[PDB]
Amino acid sequence: GPGSMKIMSDNPFDDEDGMFFVLINDEEQHSLWPTFADVPAGWRVVFGEASRASCVEYVDQHWTDIRPKSLREKLASGQG
């Protein structure tokens, strides 16, 4: 079956100290992927590996109104 090479449940993917790339799926699905992971099939890199802030700045503008109409959510906000 499948298996990870690292059992660590650490937070390395949300370090703004790391450079991330901005991906998209044809349903105008935008996401932020870390260099510590390979680009998931189905998602194309719209913005290459850049400092987390540039990535977020781009994503924040590239909402451009989503295609699929969803009513399922996690939460409208978040803190930490």
Structure commentary:
The protein has 1 helix and 3 strands; from the N terminus they run E-E-E-H. It has 80 residues and is α+β, with helices and mostly antiparallel strands. The chain has a single domain, classed as Rubredoxin-like, CATH 3.90.820.10. A hairpin with a 3-residue loop joins strand 1 (19-25) and strand 2 (29-34). The longest helix has 10 residues, at 52-61.
List keywords for this structure.
alpha+beta; globular; 80 residues; Rubredoxin-like; three-stranded antiparallel sheet; 12% helix
Task: Lay out the secondary structure.
Blueprint lengths: L18 E7 L3 E6 L9 E8 H10 L19
Antiparallel strand pairs: 1-2, 1-3
InterPro entries: MbtH-like_dom, MbtH-like_sf, MLP_fam
Protein name: Conserved hypothetical MbtH-like protein
GO cellular component, one term: cytosol
Q: Radius of gyration over alpha carbons?
A: 14 Å
Under CATH, the topology is which? Answer: Rubredoxin-like
Largest sheet: 3 strands, antiparallel
- The strand order across the widest sheet is 2-1-3
Order of helices and strands: EEEH
Number of domains: 1
Please indicate the percent range of residues in DSSP E strands (runs of 2 or more). 25-35%
* Secondary structure category: alpha+beta
Quick description:
The chain has 80 residues and is an alpha+beta fold. It is 12% helix and 26% strand. The PDB classes it as structural genomics, unknown function.
